[PDB]
Design a protein around this ligand. Structure first.
Ligand code: CL
Ligand code: CL
Ligand code: CL
Ligand code: CL
Ligand code: CL
Ligand code: CL
Ligand code: CL
Ligand code: CL
Ligand code: CL
Ligand code: CL
Ligand code: CL
Ligand code: CL
Ligand code: CL
Ligand code: CL
Ligand code: CL
Ligand code: CL
Ligand code: CL
Ligand code: CL
Ligand code: CL
Ligand code: CL
Ligand code: CL
Ligand code: CL
Ligand code: CL
Ligand code: CL
Ligand code: CL
Ligand code: CL
Ligand code: CL
Ligand code: CL
Ligand code: CL
Ligand code: CL
Ligand code: FE2
Ligand code: FE2
Ligand code: FE2
Ligand code: FE2
Ligand code: MG
Ligand code: MG
Ligand code: MG
Ligand code: MG
Ligand code: MG
Ligand code: MG
Ligand code: MG
Ligand code: MG
Ligand code: MG
Ligand code: MG
Ligand code: MG
Ligand code: MG
Ligand code: MG
Ligand code: MG
Ligand code: MG
Ligand code: MG
Ligand code: MG
Ligand code: MG
Ligand code: MG
Ligand code: MG
Ligand code: MG
Ligand code: MG
Ligand code: MG
Ligand code: MG
Ligand code: MG
Ligand code: MG
Ligand code: MG
Ligand code: MG
Ligand code: MG
Ligand code: MG
Ligand code: MG
Ligand code: MG
Ligand code: MG
Ligand code: MG
Ligand code: MG
Ligand code: MG
Ligand code: MG
Ligand code: MG
Lengths: 174, 174, 174, 174
């Protein structure tokens, strides 16, 4: 037993390692989307940079779980980071739809971890998820939903001018 | 009944007074450790100042419970502050081991108060503990554990040079 | 064929994807070393931060290969990022020995990619490796070798005081 | 023999003069594109200024070869600068397609000069091309490819609104 460990269930320790892996998986998927939108035959550079920034954020969220694990006296156990589901992402609408699904998958895992922490009467882990993860997820899901609504309004996937305008006006200039 | 009181159980009010007393007890123990490391035949002044600062923090945590009690319409009830368990603390390793135990005792009382607040359906008191106490405790327990690991690496209790180096490099210069 | 592609052999494109994966693998190994040295029963925080910074550098080196691939009209193809060889890294000497081996493995892959680029008469890829990768590798290998020499001088693995002093004086204060 | 000449083959000297001429030819083609987009019946002023800036860059690349020739003890020999292939450039897509072809023609001549320098064991000339020309060419080819992709997305040549928007958003405001 770690000398610091107190009120930290083995099941929560393991679930934190699985959550860590899912954050790294989400990072890697966003890396793939960055590289796709940077292709010369795609060439939507503000969209590419949006996904690159998301990739960096998800890696930071993984590192925060590593630090958390050690603060509680759990032990970080790493597994392979699986490659993303697709090698190419179609267009901005298809990519944003996949991003929405990914963000909801991550949110469901965080909610499931909160349920486990609640079951094991771990208020520190509940607070950590509520204070550091759950609101960020709701905000990022809302942002991507708003983007999808605007891509549909702009006539994606068929309307190339609409896709061009989204890259200029909806995502930050990079 | 206080005119402000709402959703505040008598049991929680009493447990807040007991928690207040334990914070003052923890403060007093850290005061004792300060005075010990300031002795001419101990003379580890950065270690002494670490414990003095901890003593001040624990007194602030007691005062925050006094303010909380009054905000909810409970009544502060004070009891004697018991003197610390020891009059002399051996060396930096023994003192840090006692500090780890003290911090885990305080953490267990905070977790027990959270369980009571949960049982009495008091989300304000749960939030107060999660937002103001529980993360501070995990961070301070981790810091002291890290210190103990380093004191053992430095050969305490026998290695006086190791103890000297810990005071110079591990705790803040004062 | 990409409209930008010129003098870029399929074999080099594939080898750039494999090199990308190895950079991500190296990043992940350094992440593991960070988390290990951050453990409460290891607690060498400057060593931990050295490895965390290395992890970030290797992720940047992967991203630079993604950008390169797209500049030449190749296509990024991602594979799983394999978990590191070890779950625990022993001590600062064992970790630095593994880091030296990792850096030499990465260097050998870069040298092998240079040989392939030379064989395929690709001076742009040769320049990219020489200007962005090969000197960084020699400098980082020299730094880790110097560290190993100093850890041995300090009596690792047995001399805990030596290990403590390395963390204070050899790696950047964090 | 020039007093400075060392390891500089007559064939490389002649090929540098031919490369100089091709840079001036590329400059002149970009000058023509500038004047076309500045016409009152074309009137895409940011596109015009993009090509004008390219024209100035290619003249600088010619001057750098003149300076190089003299540094090595070769002798600058000038030939006529041939007028561009077209007197009118159609529209932004046709012009960017011609620019891509021109940039790849210049790149192939630079790669051919690198092959000659390699054959004649001239590492200084190889370094000069790798350090001053080959990466610039890859970056500029990628930029023009990205532009063509976006012009096609915007519905060129038929979509005049798309062409108008490209001039406002894809090329620098002038
Ligand atoms: Cl526990
Ligand atoms: Cl508990
Ligand atoms: Cl357990
Ligand atoms: Cl696990
Ligand atoms: Cl796919
Ligand atoms: Cl998903
Ligand atoms: Cl949050
Ligand atoms: Cl605008
Ligand atoms: Cl009440
Ligand atoms: Cl109520
Ligand atoms: Cl009551
Ligand atoms: Cl009471
Ligand atoms: Cl005593
Ligand atoms: Cl205690
Ligand atoms: Cl807190
Ligand atoms: Cl090719
Ligand atoms: Cl070639
Ligand atoms: Cl090929
Ligand atoms: Cl591949
Ligand atoms: Cl292991
Ligand atoms: Cl290795
Ligand atoms: Cl380098
Ligand atoms: Cl010569
Ligand atoms: Cl020679
Ligand atoms: Cl000659
Ligand atoms: Cl000539
Ligand atoms: Cl014509
Ligand atoms: Cl041409
Ligand atoms: Cl260059
Ligand atoms: Cl607009
Ligand atoms: Fe995340
Ligand atoms: Fe306290
Ligand atoms: Fe690397
Ligand atoms: Fe040029
Ligand atoms: Mg232990
Ligand atoms: Mg377990
Ligand atoms: Mg998973
Ligand atoms: Mg698989
Ligand atoms: Mg919040
Ligand atoms: Mg955000
Ligand atoms: Mg996000
Ligand atoms: Mg918004
Ligand atoms: Mg269409
Ligand atoms: Mg009254
Ligand atoms: Mg009462
Ligand atoms: Mg008590
Ligand atoms: Mg007594
Ligand atoms: Mg907090
Ligand atoms: Mg603090
Ligand atoms: Mg404290
Ligand atoms: Mg620390
Ligand atoms: Mg002794
Ligand atoms: Mg094509
Ligand atoms: Mg191929
Ligand atoms: Mg590999
Ligand atoms: Mg495996
Ligand atoms: Mg070079
Ligand atoms: Mg260099
Ligand atoms: Mg460096
Ligand atoms: Mg490095
Ligand atoms: Mg050095
Ligand atoms: Mg020893
Ligand atoms: Mg002479
Ligand atoms: Mg000659
Ligand atoms: Mg010619
Ligand atoms: Mg003619
Ligand atoms: Mg070379
Ligand atoms: Mg360069
Ligand atoms: Mg430029
Ligand atoms: Mg150019
Ligand atoms: Mg660009
Ligand atoms: Mg039309």
């Amino acid at each position: 037993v770690s000398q610091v460990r107190q009120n930290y269930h083995s099941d929560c320790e393991a679930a934190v390692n699985r959550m860590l892996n899912l954050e790294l998986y989400a990072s890697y998927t966003y890396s793939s989307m960055y590289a796709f939108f940077d292709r010369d035959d795609v060439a939507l550079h503000n969209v590419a940079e949006f996904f690159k920034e998301n990739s960096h954020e998800e890696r930071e969220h993984a590192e925060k779980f590593m630090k958390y694990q050690n603060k509680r006296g759990g032990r970080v156990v790493l597994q392979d980071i699986k490659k993303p589901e697709r090698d190419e992402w179609g267009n901005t609408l298809e990519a944003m739809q996949a991003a929405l699904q990914l963000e909801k998958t991550v949110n469901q895992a965080l909610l499931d971890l909160h349920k486990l922490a609640t079951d094991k009467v771990d208020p520190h882990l509940c607070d950590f998820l509520e204070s550091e993860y759950l609101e960020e997820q709701v905000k990022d899901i809302k942002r991507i939903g708003d983007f999808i609504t605007n891509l549909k309004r702009l006539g994606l996937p068929e309307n190339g001018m609409g896709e061009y305008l989204f890259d200029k006006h909806s995502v930050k200039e990079s």
